[PDB]
Each structure stands twice: as structure tokens, then as C-alpha cells.
């Protein structure tokens, strides 16, 4: 199993307007299939006014710019015809400020008023986030305060209200009933105010539901476990980082610690990725790094158990440094050819980090056997033929400073991995591990 | 007559995807009618993969994101419904690289190969643009060289060929029966190789047509004059830039030589604009300027013969420093309210020079008489009750380095206007004029 994270608007255009849409997604299948992609994780396809669409104004209507509900379905159909699943990012933790539910709660409506979170005499208004620490309590003139973790325009939904519960669960059944193979529950970590409350929440919420359930609980390995089992697919921020950090600091330690810590034997499938939209792209890790180091990070990712996910463009090494509040710098148009002028190319805005003629397009890299894509095409094909590695067991045979070597095995398999993090050859079991290379014996 | 240039994607959203479209444009009518707009010029609405949309790939289909032909026309009616005309930007000078005809011409199709311009053995392959001075002749793997004054992906059509003419003649007709009121001809200055050939062309092209034919010719007034009579409406870059520079230098000199140069006695209407997408915005003119000098620029614009045009947002003070290749920095989303979060608002990308809570939104300035909007309103409202001023005659009653005074008159009408370009008070014939104020009597 190999995933691929797509930002719809930047992937492929299907109606000749430069804006990525459902039809173009549909025509990109060959690329995905040639990339050995099993399922696509599609960032917010629901109508919101933002560019990233995490503040949904309606879950029952799609983004006009991506397409119609009919077009959405023919893309689902098509993807299946080609054996690929489709997982939709679902930010049900909060609705946009303009969602009709919030618009009503605001205008006094009682039924919807309970759909959201408001300040109570016994509530701390100076309460801030655990990370950036900006307040979560936002004021209305009528002295009213509704809580919103991710800002005043992403009002948190009351998941205490058993009405919201069904209100939403009915939706999950809707998209599923429509074809959606799975969801990527956006912010799964914050559905309720206490760790214990959230676990049970998901317990009930996913009760009688089948399909890929990917959760985003950006936290300490320890917590991800508790939910772990319940979803079946947990986003492994731990290792996703540690691979790059280890390759960067040319040291196996943290990777070894994180492998044992966040991968080894889990009641669920840790989803390990190259990078995502909330951080700098693989190719820009810590002031960006070596073309050969980028590959090594991709090799390690595909030679470790769990489910390997690639954020669209990472297989080409697209550049991008995370920034605020213009987070669209890491959502550049996917470069199909060098001129970025081809039936299908997106160009809704001029590229921030990845412009035309950069030598990083699909049509450019496809040729040079030394390219990051040609390389990734290598491990994606390998991992396609070795789906037994998903649950495979790991056994370290070498924990040196600049190199790692372990063994992946199951009842009827056993493969030995050789990762050299230094840029100077080292030997193990007769094997001559080259600089910054993964060998597979 | 007052104009309004709208970049559709950044104006109003009618399908809740936070992207401008024909439906929101329709919903933006109250705004426009109340702003005193007689006709809106709409930047390229045809299918193209760029964000601006000047490299068309078909003129018979609308930019997916903006909507369908259905919605396009439901909008056309509503605008006509409110006494507003729809002028369309028409990039018929060239086609996009992906446009059908050029793709067929790339194969050799006898018919379409001659729809474009090819280099000859006696053609200076290293020709150059008059201004920035770049290559006009683009190469092709098989030695070929085609001509595209705007880029290898914007290959100009060959107008020595009647088929190209007919082809575009039908188009205009098509869009006209469609209800469109007129066209803003993009690069209307380079339709032919000889300044004589160009006029002949335009003369013959528009010979039996009716509507607002606004030409775009970026040249000395003398050239604009030769084509003048044929279109009837000419975009006036000469005076448009002078009203801005004269304000910036508090030196009426250039303005007078300019008003004399391109506005006085013309056999067609000079269209005077606040600014456009090919240069910085009014508010950012030459390091941008004070809320004072901005109103003064507008004051002057709405008190001169010809047709005053406002590039969307300029009535608000929208900053925007022009630059390339990311020319979308001047196309910031038109801010309806401060939080930029209200049904109809766009946010397809994070603003470049006009982020949220910047005090320039429409809802914010509607509640302040001193705001650039209130000031523009008075000017459009005034010029609305003085239709005679477009065809009006001018003569200078007073010419002083820092303040201008002149007379607008026709047979039954006469008006005195007083402009103060300096920050120091000035009085003329028993009438003081505060710093940067304008007075009409
Ligand atoms: C309104 C917003 O909507 C969208 O914003 C989105 C939303 C809201 O719909 C949710 C998701 N992302 C959230 C996540 O669901 C949440 O739990 C937390 O995640 C924080 C995390 O809670 C914190 O603990 C720390 O996590 C720590 C770990 O705990 C630690 O163990 C070790 O691994 O280090 C990391 C980081 O140092 O930092 C993370 C990010 O900085 O914030 C991120 C941004 C999306 O990916 C994101 O695009 C847009 O993306 C935004 O731009 C927009 O502003
Ligand atoms: C393919 C392209 O499409 C789009 O570009 C678009 C196209 C392509 O269809 C045409 C139009 N604009 C063209 C214009 O139609 C053309 O004639 C020339 O216009 C030149 C002019 O010909 C030249 O003489 C000089 O003008 C002189 C006057 O003659 C002189 O009297 C005094 O006023 O000083 C000025 C400047 O010093 O500079 C002007 C601009 O720099 O270039 C501008 C950019 C549009 O506004 C523009 O958005 C995008 O904007 C681009 O980013 C993209 O690359
Ligand atoms: Ca599209
Ligand atoms: Ca829209």
C-alpha cells in the first residue's frame, strides 16, 4: 500500500483553466498507477472560500472550481476502474465561519446554537493554544464568545451534542455511500477536551463503519496508540520527521529510537510520509538539502513498515518552505513538463518555489535515469511487489553511528535493509553499502 | 460614462469556492450601480491555463472557474437589467500555445499552419521588443522559429491571412449576439506590422459593427490619435500616468502638457484610468502615496473630459506593487469586509499587499465619509449628473506650478475646476484650496 497526498487545485486541470479539478485528477491516473499509488488522500474537496478549504461552509456541496458532484463521482468510478482508492480529508472538527449552522447560531437560532462552543461564567477567556498559544476564545459584540481552536473563522463544533454526532456521522455514510473509500479526519486529536473523551468519541463515531480511516493526531507517540487501533491508519509524524532529521544530522540514533518507538508492533498501521502542507517540503528540510539526501529519505520511508505516503510533488523533489499566513507556498502547481505549458498543467498562481524550466518536471525527470522521480519510481515499484512489509516485523542487525541495517520478515518472508547515512562507504555482511544508499538483500 | 475594470477571480464569489465567477459578478451589481458604474470591462474570461488569461486556448468557451455559458449569460442579462454594459477583454492578437490552431500548426496542417507567423531565411531571428527588448522569434526543435511578441506560449496570429480575420470577425459577432456590449482589445497596437497596416485593419475589422470598442495601444498620443476615430474609445495611458506623476511631484507641468496633448479636441473618447494590472496600483504609484494624493488623483480623473475608469479596488486604496513573473501581486482579492470572510468574498490565495483587517474593505469605508471610497463615490455620483463632461471642452483659467484651474464647458454647460497639487494652502480669485483639495464651481 502506497498513498499519495494531493492538493486538488495544484495537481491536474481537466477543463482548460489552469485550476486543478476532478476531471484532471481523473486523467492523472496513469501517472499515479505508474507511481504505484494505492490510494490518494485528497485535501478538502468541500466548498469553503479559502484556498486550502479546511474551513468548510458546506459538506454537501463540492468546490465549484474542482467540479460538480457528478464530476466528483465519475472521478471516483474511474479511479476504481484503475484500482485506486480515494480518501477525502474530513475537517469535521469545526465548520467555517459562514457555515449555515454557524450563521444561524449567531442569529439567535437555538437548535443550531448548541452545535457550537460558547463561553460559560466558569470558563477561562485567556485560554490559548498549546503550541503557538494564541487565544481560542473569540468575541462577538453581544458579549458572546464561541470557542474556535483554529481561529475565529473556524468555530469549533460541539461534539458533546449528540445531534452534531449524528449530523456528521450521517455525512460520513453519505460520502462513503457515494464511493469514498476512506477519510482523513482532519484534527482528529481535538474532537473532545480530554484525551479519554476523544478515544471513546472515535470509538462510537467509527462503530459500524468500514474503510480507510486515517487520523491526524500530531502528538507524542504514546497518544497516537490509544486512538491507533480505532482508526487502523495513524499519521506517523514521529518517524516522518525522524527519517529526515536522521538523514540531515547524518545520525541513526533518533531514527532508531523513533522506529522502535513509533513503528514496531502496533494495533494499527502507522502512515509514514515524505512531508505535508503544514510544513516545508521534503526537498527543503532544514534549509533544504542534497539531491542524494532527498532520495535516501525516500528509500528509508519505503523500506520501513507502515504505510508510505508521498505528498504530491515530493517524488520530484519540489521545493517549498513553510510560511504564514501564505501557506500556499508549499502548494505550488505540479510541474508536468519544463515549460509548465501542457494540456493538464495547473497554473492558478505563479510558482513560489518551483517555477518553469527548473529541471524538476515529470516529463524532464522521467527521462534522466538519475532523477528523483526515476529513483522514487524505483522504490514505489519495489514496495508494490512487497506489500508484506506493511505489517512485516523489524530486527536491527546494525546500530552504528553513520549506518543502519535491520531485517524485515514475516511468516513467509525476510528482507535485509542497508541504509548508509554518511557520504563514505561502509561494509556489512560482505555488502558494500554506498554513500547515502539503501540496498535490499 | 464611468468604467470599472474587473479581474473576475478577485472580485466577487457566487459559488462559495472563494473564487470569483460570473455568478458573484452578477451579485456584485448593487455595488457597481451604487458606485456609479456605467460599464465594466472584464479581464479575459475565455479558457486559458494562466491566472490572468491572456493566452487563450479557445474563445468559444469560458474559464471553467468563472462558470459556464449559462451563468455567463444569466449575468449578462442582470448587468443589462441595471443599466450596465459588459465590455469583454478580447485577447485576439494571439492564441495560447495550447490553443487548437497552433497545436495543429505545430504538426503542419496546411490550413492552420498559416494562422501563425513563421520566420524566414531573410528574417532577423534576433529581433527585439521595443520596450523590455526581448526575443520575438521563438525556436522549435526542428529548426523552426515562430513569432510571439508576448512569449513562446502566446504565438501571435497572422493577420495577412483573411481566414484569421474571418475567424475573429465571427467571434466578435458571436459574443455580440451573446449580448456583450463591447470589447477591450488587448495588444490592439500590434495587429499589423506597419502603423498604417494596423489602422487599415482595425478600420476594416470594425467597419460594420456596433458597440463599445475600447482599444489598448500603449504609445505616444500621436499614435492613439490615428486609430482614435475607428474605435471611438481609446485607453489613455498618456494622461492616465500624468495625473499620477503630476500629483507625486506637486508639479502641474506634465499634467497640463498631457491634458493638452491627449484630451483636448479628439474625435473619439480618451479613457482615463486610475491604473491597471500591467503596472502598480494607484495607491502604490512610485513608492505609493498618501491617502491625500490618492483622492487628488481621483479628483483630477473625474474632472477631465473623456471616460474615467477605475481598476477594481482603486476606489478602496488597494496597494499593489507591480512586478514579474508573479504579476498576480496587483490582483489581490477585492476586500468586501475587514476579516475577508463574508458570502461573496474571494480568497483564492493569501493577499500580496492587502491582507485582512487593513482598514481598506468596502464594509469598513461605507461607514466613514473620509474614506477613499466615500470620496470616489462623490466623484462618480457628481460626474453622473454631468454626462456632458466626457465630450466637454477645456481651457485653462489658471496655471501655477502647484495648483491648476480650468474650465469645462459645452454649449449649455460650464464649470470651473480648482486642483491643489501641493500640501500648502493656496487661494485663487477669492477661493482658498486646502492642501491637495479639488473644487468645482
Ligand atoms: C485555519 C487554518 O486552517 C488550515 O489548518 C489545518 C487544520 C484545521 O482544519 C488542521 C490540520 N493541522 C493541525 C492539527 O490538526 C492540530 O492538531 C495542530 O498540530 C500542531 C500540534 O497540535 C502541536 O502539538 C505541534 O506538534 C508537535 C508534536 O506535539 C510534538 O510531539 C513534535 O512532533 O513536534 C510537533 C511540532 O513541533 O505543532 C503542530 C503544528 O505546528 O495544528 C495543525 C496545524 C491541517 O493539517 C491544517 O491544514 C490551514 O492549514 C492553516 O494555515 C489555517 O490557518
Ligand atoms: C504573456 C503576458 O501576458 C500578459 O500581458 C498582457 C497582454 C498580452 O495579451 C497585453 C497587455 N499589455 C501589453 C500591451 O498590449 C503591449 O502593446 C505592450 O505595451 C508596452 C508598450 O508597447 C511599449 O511601447 C511601452 O510603453 C511606453 C509608451 O509607448 C510611452 O509613450 C510611455 O507611456 O512609456 C511607456 C512605458 O515606458 O511599454 C508597454 C509596457 O511596458 O506591452 C504590454 C505589457 C495586457 O495589459 C497584459 O496584461 C501578462 O501581463 C504578462 O505577465 C505575460 O507574460
Ligand atoms: Ca479547472
Ligand atoms: Ca467561484
Helix B291-301 to helix B237-248 angle (10° resolution) is: 140
* Angle at B277 (CA atoms; ends B273, B280), nearest 5 degrees: 85
Q: How far is the CA of B218 from the centre of ligand 2 (A)?
A: 7
- Interstrand relation of B39-42 and A269-273 (parallel, antiparallel or unpaired): unpaired
Structure determination technique employed: X-ray
Q: Does A346 touch chain B (CB under 8 A)?
A: yes
Query: Are residues A109 and A78 part of one domain?
Result: no
Which of A105, A137, A158 is the last residue in one of the domains? A158
- Interstrand relation of B182-185 and A46-47 (parallel, antiparallel or unpaired): unpaired
**Which residue matches cell numbers 462558470?**
B67
Q: Residue A219: CB within 6 Å of ligand 1?
A: yes
- The grid cell for B179 is 449580448
Do the beta carbons of residue B307 and residue B275 sit within 8 Å?
no
Query: Are residues B355 and B252 part of one domain?
Result: yes
Considering B89, B181, B186, B328, which one is annotated as catalytic? B186
Query: Are residues A88 and A102 part of one domain?
Result: no
Q: Does B69 touch chain A (CB under 8 A)?
A: no
Query: Are residues A135 and A78 part of one domain?
Result: no
Query: Are residues A236 and A103 part of one domain?
Result: no
Query: Are residues A240 and A115 part of one domain?
Result: no
Rounded to 5 degrees, φ, ψ at A206 are -105, 5
> Could you tell me which residues come within 8 angstroms of residue A384 by beta carbon, excluding any fewer than 6 positions away?
A2, A36
CA distance A419 to A360: 25
Interface probe for A, chosen from B64, B67, B322 (most Cβ of A below 10 Å), is B64
Domain at A373, CATH number: 3.20.20.80
CA distance B247 to B167: 45
Q: How far is the CA of A30 from the centre of ligand 4 (A)?
A: 29
Query: Are residues A241 and A184 part of one domain?
Result: yes
CB neighbours of residue B226 within 10 Å? 15
Check A64 against B16: CB less than 8 A apart.
yes
Query: Are residues A11 and A1 part of one domain?
Result: yes
Selection from B198, B276, B291 nearest residue B236 by Cα: B276
Domain at B152, CATH number: 3.90.400.10
Domain at A433, CATH number: 2.60.40.1180
Number of domains in chain A: 3
Do the beta carbons of residue B393 and residue B411 sit within 8 Å?
no
Range of the domain at B189: 1-93+159-391
Instruction: Give the resolution to one decimal, in Å.
Output: 2.5
Query: B72 CA to chain A: closest CA distance, Å?
Result: 15
Rounded to 5 degrees, φ, ψ at B25 are -55, -40
Selection from B304, B307, B300 nearest residue B268 by Cα: B307
Selection from B139, B221, B211, B148 nearest residue B182 by Cα: B211
Would you give the DSSP letter of residue B402?
T
Q: Which of residues 10-49 of A touch B (CB under 8 A)?
A: 13, 15-19, 21, 47-49
CA distance A311 to A306: 16
Query: Are residues B350 and B264 part of one domain?
Result: yes
Q: How far is the CA of A164 from the centre of ligand 2 (A)?
A: 55
Q: Does B141 touch chain A (CB under 8 A)?
A: no
Binding residues of B for Ca(2+): 13, 15, 17, 19, 21
Would you give the DSSP letter of residue A155?
P
Query: Are residues A172 and A116 part of one domain?
Result: no
Q: Which residues pair with B5 in a beta bridge?
A: B41, B311
CA distance B195 to A270: 69
Rounded to 5 degrees, φ, ψ at A409 are -155, 165
Ligand 2 atom having least distance to the Cα of B94 = 9
- Give Cα separations from A77 to A27, A211, B53 (angstroms): 12, 16, 32
- The grid cell for B32 is 457597481
Q: Considering only CA atoms, which residue is closest to atom 20 of ligand 2?
A: B218
Query: Are residues B296 and B401 part of one domain?
Result: no
Query: Are residues B371 and B260 part of one domain?
Result: yes
Nearest ligand, CA of residue B258? 2
> Could you tell me which residues come within 8 angstroms of residue A75 by beta carbon, excluding any fewer than 6 positions away?
A22, A23, A25, A26, A67, A86
Amino acid at each position: 500500500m502506497i498513498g499519495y497526498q494531493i492538493y486538488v487545485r495544484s495537481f491536474r486541470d481537466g477543463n482548460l483553466d489552469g485550476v486543478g479539478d476532478f476531471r484532471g485528477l481523473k486523467n492523472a491516473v496513469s501517472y499515479l498507477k505508474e507511481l504505484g499509488i494505492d490510494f490518494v488522500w485528497l485535501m478538502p474537496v468541500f466548498s469553503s472560500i479559502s484556498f486550502h478549504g479546511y474551513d468548510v461552509v458546506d459538506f454537501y456541496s463540492f468546490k465549484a472550481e474542482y467540479g460538480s458532484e457528478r464530476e466528483f463521482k465519475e472521478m471516483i468510478e474511474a479511479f476504481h476502474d484503475s484500482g485506486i482508492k480515494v480518501v477525502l480529508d474530513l475537517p469535521i472538527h469545526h465548520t467555517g465561519f459562514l457555515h449555515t449552522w454557524f450563521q444561524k447560531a449567531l442569529k439567535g437560532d437555538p437548535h443550531y446554537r448548541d452545535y457550537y462552543v460558547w463561553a460559560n461564567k466558569e470558563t477561562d477567556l485567556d485560554e490559548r493554544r498549546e503550541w503557538d498559544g494564541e487565544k481560542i476564545w473569540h468575541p462577538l459584540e453581544d458579549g458572546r464568545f464561541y470557542r474556535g481552536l483554529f481561529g475565529p473563522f473556524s468555530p469549533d463544533l460541539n461534539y458533546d451534542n449528540p445531534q452534531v454526532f449524528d449530523e456528521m456521522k450521517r455525512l460520513v455514510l453519505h460520502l462513503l455511500d457515494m464511493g469514498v473509500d476512506g477519510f482523513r479526519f482532519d484534527a482528529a486529536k481535538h474532537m473532545r477536551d480530554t484525551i479519554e473523551q476523544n478515544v471513546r468519541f472515535w470509538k462510537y463515531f467509527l462503530s459500524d463503519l468500514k474503510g480507510i480511516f486515517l487520523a491526524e493526531i500530531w502528538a507524542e507517540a504514546r497518544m497516537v496508540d490509544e486512538h491507533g487501533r480505532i482508526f487502523g491508519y495513524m499519521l506517523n509524524f514521529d518517524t516522518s520527521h525522524c527519517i529526515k532529521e536522521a538523514v540531515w544530522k547524518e545520525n541513526t540514533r533518533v531514527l532508531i529510537e523513533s522506529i522502535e518507538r513509533a513503528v514496531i508492533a502496533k494495533d494499527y498501521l502507522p502512515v509514514n510520509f515524505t512531508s505535508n502542507h503544514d510544513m516545508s517540503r521534503l526537498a527543503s528540510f532544514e534549509g533544504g538539502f542534497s539531491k542524494e539526501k532527498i532520495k535516501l529519505s525516500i528509500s528509508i520511508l519505503f523500506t520501513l513498515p507502515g504505510v508510505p505516503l508521498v505528498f504530491y510533488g515530493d517524488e520530484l523533489g519540489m521545493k517549498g518552505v513553510y510560511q504564514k499566513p501564505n501557506t500556499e507556498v508549499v502548494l505550488d502547481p505540479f510541474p508536468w513538463n519544463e515549460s509548465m505549458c501542457v494540456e493538464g498543467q495547473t497554473f492558478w498562481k505563479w510558482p513560489a518555489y518551483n517555477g518553469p524550466f527548473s529541471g524538476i518536471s515529470v516529463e524532464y525527470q522521467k527521462r534522466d535515469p538519475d532523477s528523483i522521480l526515476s529513483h522514487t519510481l524505483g522504490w514505489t515499484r519495489f514496495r508494490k511487489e512487497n506489500q508484506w512489509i506493511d505489517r512485516a516485523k523489524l530486527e536491527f542487525l546494525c546500530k552504528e553511528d553513520k549506518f543502519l541495517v535491520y531485517r524485515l520478515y514475516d511468516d513467509q518472508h525476510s528482507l535485509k535493509v542497508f541504509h548508509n547515512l554518511s557520504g563514505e562507504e561502509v561494509v556489512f555482511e560482505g555488502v558494500k553499502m554506498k554513500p547515502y544508499k539503501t540496498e535490499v538483500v
